[PDB]
Design a protein around this ligand. Sequence first.
Ligand SMILES: *[C@@H]1O[C@H](CO)[C@@H](O)[C@H](O)[C@H]1NC(C)=O
Ligand SMILES: *[C@@H]1O[C@H](CO)[C@@H](O)[C@H](O)[C@H]1NC(C)=O
Ligand SMILES: *[C@@H]1O[C@H](CO)[C@@H](O)[C@H](O)[C@H]1NC(C)=O
Ligand SMILES: *[C@@H]1O[C@H](CO)[C@@H](O)[C@H](O)[C@H]1NC(C)=O
Lengths: 188, 15, 185, 202
Amino acid sequence: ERHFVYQFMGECYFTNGTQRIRYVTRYIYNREEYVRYDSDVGEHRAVTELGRPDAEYWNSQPEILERTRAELDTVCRHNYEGPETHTSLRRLEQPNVVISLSRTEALNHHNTLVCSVTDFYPAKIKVRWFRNGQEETVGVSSTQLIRNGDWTFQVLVMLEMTPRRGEVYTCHVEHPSLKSPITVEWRA
Amino acid sequence: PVSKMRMATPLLMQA
Amino acid sequence: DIEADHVGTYGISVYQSPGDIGQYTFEFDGDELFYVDLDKKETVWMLPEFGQLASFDPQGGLQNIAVVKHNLGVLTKRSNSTPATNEAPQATVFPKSPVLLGQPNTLICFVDNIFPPVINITWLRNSKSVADGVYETSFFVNRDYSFHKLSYLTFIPSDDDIYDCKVEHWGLEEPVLKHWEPEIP
Amino acid sequence: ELPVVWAQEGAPVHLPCSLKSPNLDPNFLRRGGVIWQHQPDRYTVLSVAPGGLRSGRQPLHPHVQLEERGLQRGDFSLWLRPALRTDAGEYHATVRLPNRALSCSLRLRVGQASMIASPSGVLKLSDWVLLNCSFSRPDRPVSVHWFQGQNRVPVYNSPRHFLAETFLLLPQVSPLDSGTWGCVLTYRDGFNVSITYNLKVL
Ligand SMILES: *[C@@H]1O[C@H](CO)[C@@H](O)[C@H](O)[C@H]1NC(C)=O
Ligand SMILES: *[C@@H]1O[C@H](CO)[C@@H](O)[C@H](O)[C@H]1NC(C)=O
Ligand SMILES: *[C@@H]1O[C@H](CO)[C@@H](O)[C@H](O)[C@H]1NC(C)=O
Ligand SMILES: *[C@@H]1O[C@H](CO)[C@@H](O)[C@H](O)[C@H]1NC(C)=O
């Protein structure tokens, strides 16, 4: 009659591509974990006292335990050196940079230009403002990493600006998919 | 051609 | 907690009893690869181009749900445990691309801390239900075991057109809808 | 002429600022922006549009999220989870509605409240003892409350419990006086401190 929730997942942890690999598998029930296996452990442990005989029950079947250990090479290492190498690893999306500003209605009045950067992948990106060829960092406010949910990322930046005559404000952005650093400017 | 994606296999505790 | 270069979550089995609610999905680096349909016996990809360059056996994904069903079946009788209190979700409405009046855009409704993952997500164009261009994506998981989902909506922005995102959740004492307008900007 | 507000490190702080108290249409309410800045004695630490997008300082916030129901009940409030000792400084606001607008302002001082014992360490079978719970605030507390045990049984002035200027003393500490002893302070603005300490008695 009442409600309950169960969850299973398998996590492949990669470092430097294929040099050091780690395979961990969780067993979640009711937003709680009770049995876990780690490639650095070599067997099934018990996160809670509930799955203590369960972990040893799966530690009592030697044929099944080796398939799990071999799954580090069959599931994790093969997919990284296979599908992902042919799909996700070779996926690059360039960001879209736009400069806008709200709350301004008069000339030479304090405000904070907004540099908006959306639809980019992967997430290894940084953004820096540039006034007249000088990287600005004082009074800078920016959104955090906003996952677009469709194989893209977005993030916005705002710089508290004073409308000085003879001004060149540039939103400089560098990215690995961006073979060249993109610079979008704005003036009075 | 293509390359298949191998999945993670779960386990079944007894009753 | 733990760090790595990249992490791909292959195999996401979730079961909810009663009602026999299941879901199988693949994921990688905070991003879904594809999901296997339960009853139509097919593998649906979030992006089609990766389905053209890779194929997954849907039978293996169903064996996961079948064992998990057997898993939860033994675990619900093994313990007299009480249900987890239904967490109240929190949402955020945002456009995919910058707002441009008269230009097509995709309005997204991201909702985090969804627990349990049983919730209707709908839109209201000027307090009127519109089901055109609605993409209901599969749930996601984060390392606190809560879940987050996304929903998309294509539209034409205008000052006289106000939009919002409706939420129908179990733990909510009442349905909540955060109203966003490009007219405010 | 800006007011000043205190806070105790180790517990969340209440930083509210609502538009008076007229009941309004919730549809108009959700069409409201908010910008909060900070300057030490930071700048645009968190800024959220009606859409709910959280923007602000480059580092992430210390679980500093506004109450989801407060934004739909005519309230704009800051709720950090940890009272950071460094947050002490000036804070300004910027609330934007299609018709009206308000922008409150105040200060913030971090007052590390702690209880200091005169006999430093465990107590003997028979010896006096002194405790002083107090925040680092120049104004003096108006009322003082103390309690004994894990069930928080309020301690009142007795022939064995003596209290004055937020000091408590027991001259003979029988083994029954062991346990977690705490206190409760008060102020003119209603600041309340509940520092508790497990008394160690032979
Ligand atoms: C990372 O991998 C590269 C290529 O195999 C190797 O040259 C380098 O030494 C590795 N770095 C490590 C293991 O820290
Ligand atoms: C979702 O909608 C269905 C029917 O439309 C309803 O039975 C169910 O309770 C809803 N879920 C909620 C309110 O969480
Ligand atoms: C003791 O507490 C009082 C008020 O509770 C405070 O003013 C004082 O600084 C504290 N310390 C002393 C007297 O050493
Ligand atoms: C002290 O602060 C408020 C306002 O005076 C009061 O209502 C509350 O009971 C006190 N704090 C706690 C945590 O009890």
